[PDB]
Design an enzyme around this catalytic site. Structure first.
Site, PDB file in Angstrom:
ATOM      1  N   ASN A  87      37.159  30.774  37.628  1.00 25.95           N
ATOM      2  CA  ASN A  87      35.928  31.265  37.088  1.00 25.95           C
ATOM      3  C   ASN A  87      36.301  32.156  35.926  1.00 25.95           C
ATOM      4  OD1 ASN A  87      35.241  34.570  37.668  1.00 25.95           O
ATOM      5  ND2 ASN A  87      36.687  33.835  38.984  1.00 25.95           N
ATOM      6  N   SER A  92      40.167  42.168  36.142  1.00 27.25           N
ATOM      7  CA  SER A  92      39.580  40.674  35.975  1.00 27.25           C
ATOM      8  C   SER A  92      40.351  40.360  34.787  1.00 27.25           C
ATOM      9  CB  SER A  92      38.255  41.013  35.681  1.00 27.25           C
ATOM     10  OG  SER A  92      37.421  40.192  35.169  1.00 27.25           O
ATOM     11  N   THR A 115      37.530  39.821  30.848  1.00 26.57           N
ATOM     12  CA  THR A 115      37.148  40.969  30.061  1.00 26.57           C
ATOM     13  C   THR A 115      38.260  41.449  29.115  1.00 26.57           C
ATOM     14  OG1 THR A 115      35.314  41.602  31.298  1.00 26.57           O
ATOM     15  CG2 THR A 115      36.360  43.339  29.836  1.00 26.57           C
ATOM     16  N   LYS A 148      42.195  47.794  42.282  1.00 23.92           N
ATOM     17  CA  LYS A 148      42.370  46.181  42.417  1.00 23.92           C
ATOM     18  C   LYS A 148      43.270  45.976  41.316  1.00 23.92           C
ATOM     19  CE  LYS A 148      40.094  41.958  43.660  1.00 23.92           C
ATOM     20  NZ  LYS A 148      38.903  41.466  44.062  1.00 23.92           N
ATOM     21  N   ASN A 177      43.540  40.523  42.371  1.00 25.97           N
ATOM     22  CA  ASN A 177      42.558  39.704  41.691  1.00 25.97           C
ATOM     23  C   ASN A 177      43.046  37.980  41.535  1.00 25.97           C
ATOM     24  OD1 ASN A 177      40.103  39.153  40.214  1.00 25.97           O
ATOM     25  ND2 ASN A 177      40.197  41.316  39.777  1.00 25.97           N
TER      26      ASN A 177
HETATM   27  C1  LIG Z   1      33.451  33.288  41.143  1.00 28.03           C
HETATM   28  C2  LIG Z   1      34.473  34.332  41.460  1.00 28.03           C
HETATM   29  C3  LIG Z   1      33.982  35.566  41.140  1.00 28.03           C
HETATM   30  C4  LIG Z   1      34.703  36.969  41.379  1.00 28.03           C
HETATM   31  N1  LIG Z   1      34.196  38.016  40.682  1.00 28.03           N
HETATM   32  C5  LIG Z   1      34.970  39.207  41.115  1.00 28.03           C
HETATM   33  C6  LIG Z   1      34.506  40.670  40.547  1.00 28.03           C
HETATM   34  O1  LIG Z   1      33.461  40.579  40.248  1.00 28.03           O
HETATM   35  N2  LIG Z   1      35.156  41.487  40.833  1.00 28.03           N
HETATM   36  C7  LIG Z   1      36.508  41.603  41.501  1.00 28.03           C
HETATM   37  O2  LIG Z   1      37.136  42.460  41.654  1.00 28.03           O
HETATM   38  N3  LIG Z   1      37.001  40.107  41.991  1.00 28.03           N
HETATM   39  C8  LIG Z   1      36.063  39.093  41.550  1.00 28.03           C
HETATM   40  N4  LIG Z   1      36.637  38.004  42.125  1.00 28.03           N
HETATM   41  C9  LIG Z   1      38.066  38.047  42.766  1.00 28.03           C
HETATM   42  C10 LIG Z   1      38.087  37.837  44.395  1.00 28.03           C
HETATM   43  O3  LIG Z   1      37.517  39.173  44.819  1.00 28.03           O
HETATM   44  C11 LIG Z   1      39.440  37.665  44.962  1.00 28.03           C
HETATM   45  O4  LIG Z   1      40.071  38.761  44.481  1.00 28.03           O
HETATM   46  C12 LIG Z   1      40.150  36.394  44.597  1.00 28.03           C
HETATM   47  O5  LIG Z   1      39.051  35.437  44.216  1.00 28.03           O
HETATM   48  C13 LIG Z   1      40.889  35.846  45.407  1.00 28.03           C
HETATM   49  O6  LIG Z   1      40.651  35.773  46.652  1.00 28.03           O
HETATM   50  P1  LIG Z   1      39.962  34.130  47.208  1.00 28.03           P
HETATM   51  O7  LIG Z   1      41.326  33.200  46.852  1.00 28.03           O
HETATM   52  O8  LIG Z   1      40.049  34.356  48.680  1.00 28.03           O
HETATM   53  O9  LIG Z   1      38.847  33.831  46.404  1.00 28.03           O
HETATM   54  C14 LIG Z   1      35.998  36.723  41.784  1.00 28.03           C
HETATM   55  C15 LIG Z   1      36.247  35.652  42.501  1.00 28.03           C
HETATM   56  C16 LIG Z   1      35.734  34.449  42.371  1.00 28.03           C
HETATM   57  C17 LIG Z   1      36.011  33.202  43.019  1.00 28.03           C
HETATM   58  O1  LIG Z   2      34.499  36.843  35.549  1.00 28.11           O
HETATM   59  C1  LIG Z   2      34.482  38.043  36.499  1.00 28.11           C
HETATM   60  O2  LIG Z   2      33.368  38.499  36.609  1.00 28.11           O
HETATM   61  C2  LIG Z   2      35.525  38.180  37.540  1.00 28.11           C
HETATM   62  C3  LIG Z   2      36.242  37.156  37.847  1.00 28.11           C
HETATM   63  C4  LIG Z   2      37.325  37.519  38.820  1.00 28.11           C
HETATM   64  O3  LIG Z   2      38.165  36.387  38.838  1.00 28.11           O
HETATM   65  N1  LIG Z   2      37.669  38.496  38.889  1.00 28.11           N
HETATM   66  C5  LIG Z   2      37.074  39.696  38.435  1.00 28.11           C
HETATM   67  O4  LIG Z   2      37.540  40.954  38.758  1.00 28.11           O
HETATM   68  N2  LIG Z   2      36.041  39.291  37.656  1.00 28.11           N
END
Ligand SMILES: Cc1cc2nc3c(=O)[nH]c(=O)nc-3n(C[C@H](O)[C@H](O)[C@H](O)COP(=O)(O)O)c2cc1C
Ligand SMILES: O=C(O)c1cc(=O)[nH]c(=O)[nH]1
Ligand SMILES: [Cl-]
Length: 349
Positions: A98, A168, A171, A208, A237
């Site tokens: 993403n 993230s 950004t 995080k 993340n």
């Molecule tokens: C589509 C998507 C959007 C995410 N948006 C955020 C976000 O806004 N803030 C954040 O701290 N992590 C974000 N993450 C990261 C997840 O919180 C997590 O740290 C990461 O996906 C690993 O866990 P998973 O393998 O179970 O998905 C996002 C992940 C995905 C897949």
């Molecule tokens: O694009 C985002 O908003 C986003 C994606 C991701 O993997 N982690 C995060 O912290 N933000």
């Protein structure tokens, strides 16, 4: 999977919010209870940030059987995020990439949504179902510390814990905030702001972090966390790495990779951060969890709690009960009295 991933996500949030999916049947055993971050967690399996970016589906997520919910990331002002397309499935890898770029309704909108159910949340928290709020920064912010401070001021009073998301990949310049000097400055201000809130409205503060850090980066973060009395870490993340072996056609899209290819990288990061903090700093472990074994590996590595997101997009809502049931079975098999007994168990071997 017959819709584009972003449309699928939107519908998933909508269906969840409306409580359309069935109430989770799995009743949580006492074995799954964790007391950490000043709160009781009925079970240690949370929904990771990013699924419910704007706090629209909190109650639906508890109904799904999550022991805690984290919303966000939320930015101070509303912003649209990156141009489409910006999310990609890698089914052959059980992964997602993403590059949303912090699409966010903004602090004001989220504040109002959480206020509408603030007393309900107070009861849920009391009943072992806490709420986390994950803070981001606007694209065109000149002072990151001010963005995070505003987040503390506005959503801190509505949260059991806050997350300073400096990891993230989507950004520009954000992840430079993980550097020692930048992090110390940022977290000092964040903690000052948090300490200014009335006691019943004063959340735990976690940072995080990325899975892509150097050994030096990790040592520095551990040092700062300990110095400042940061309440916990979320590890990790998404990764900007592309592990050898990815098969998905979309593997070379820009963005953060999540799901199974991230799993062990995340676990190893947990293991390292636990050791660097002498097991005295609670860790929420996240990355590629889709089973009880995945959860327990992170717990034994040092996580007090775990989260998942990507698994939900492949396995659907049943994955939650599956993780919990499998975790319970494994704890019993390995002679643990409960989750608490297993936290950091690998380090005591
Ligand atoms: C589509 C998507 C959007 C995410 N948006 C955020 C976000 O806004 N803030 C954040 O701290 N992590 C974000 N993450 C990261 C997840 O919180 C997590 O740290 C990461 O996906 C690993 O866990 P998973 O393998 O179970 O998905 C996002 C992940 C995905 C897949
Ligand atoms: O694009 C985002 O908003 C986003 C994606 C991701 O993997 N982690 C995060 O912290 N933000
Ligand atoms: Cl308030």
């Amino acid at each position: 999977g017959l819709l584009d991933p972003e449309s699928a996500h939107r519908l998933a949030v909508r269906f969840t919010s409306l409580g359309l999916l069935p109430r989770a049947r799995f009743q949580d055993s006492d074995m799954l209870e964790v007391r950490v971050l000043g709160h009781k967690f009925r079970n240690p399996v949370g929904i990771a940030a990013g699924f419910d970016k704007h706090g629209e589906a909190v109650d639906g997520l508890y109904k799904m059987g999550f022991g805690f919910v984290e919303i966000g990331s939320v930015t101070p002002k509303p912003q649209e995020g990156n141009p489409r397309p910006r999310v990609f499935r890698l089914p052959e890898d059980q992964a997602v990439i993403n590059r949303y770029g912090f699409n966010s309704h903004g602090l004001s909108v989220v504040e109002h949504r959480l206020r509408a159910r603030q007393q309900k949340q107070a009861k849920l928290t009391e009943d072992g179902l806490p709420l986390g709020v994950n803070l981001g920064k606007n694209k065109t912010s000149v002072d990151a510390a001010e963005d995070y401070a505003e987040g503390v001021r506005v959503l801190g009073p509505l949260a059991d814990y806050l997350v300073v998301n400096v990891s993230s990949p989507n950004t520009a310049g954000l992840r430079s905030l993980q550097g020692k000097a930048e992090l110390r400055r940022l977290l000092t201000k964040v903690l000052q702001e948090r300490d200014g809130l009335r006691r019943v409205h004063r959340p735990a503060v976690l940072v995080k972090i990325a899975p892509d850090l150097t050994s030096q980066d990790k040592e520095d973060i551990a040092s700062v966390v300990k110095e400042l009395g940061i309440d916990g870490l979320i590890v990790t993340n998404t990764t900007v790495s592309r592990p050898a072996g990815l098969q998905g056609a979309l593997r070379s899209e820009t963005g953060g990779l999540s799901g199974k290819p991230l799993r062990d990288l995340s676990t190893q990061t947990i293991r390292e951060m636990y050791a660097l903090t002498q097991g005295r700093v609670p860790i929420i472990g996240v990355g590629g969890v889709s089973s009880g074994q995945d959860a327990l590996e992170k717990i034994r590595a040092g996580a007090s709690l775990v989260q998942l997101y990507t698994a939900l997009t492949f396995w659907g809502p049943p994955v939650v009960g599956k993780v919990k049931r499998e975790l319970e079975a494994l704890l019993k098999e390995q002679g643990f009295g409960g989750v608490t007994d297993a936290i950091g168990a690998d380090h005591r071997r």
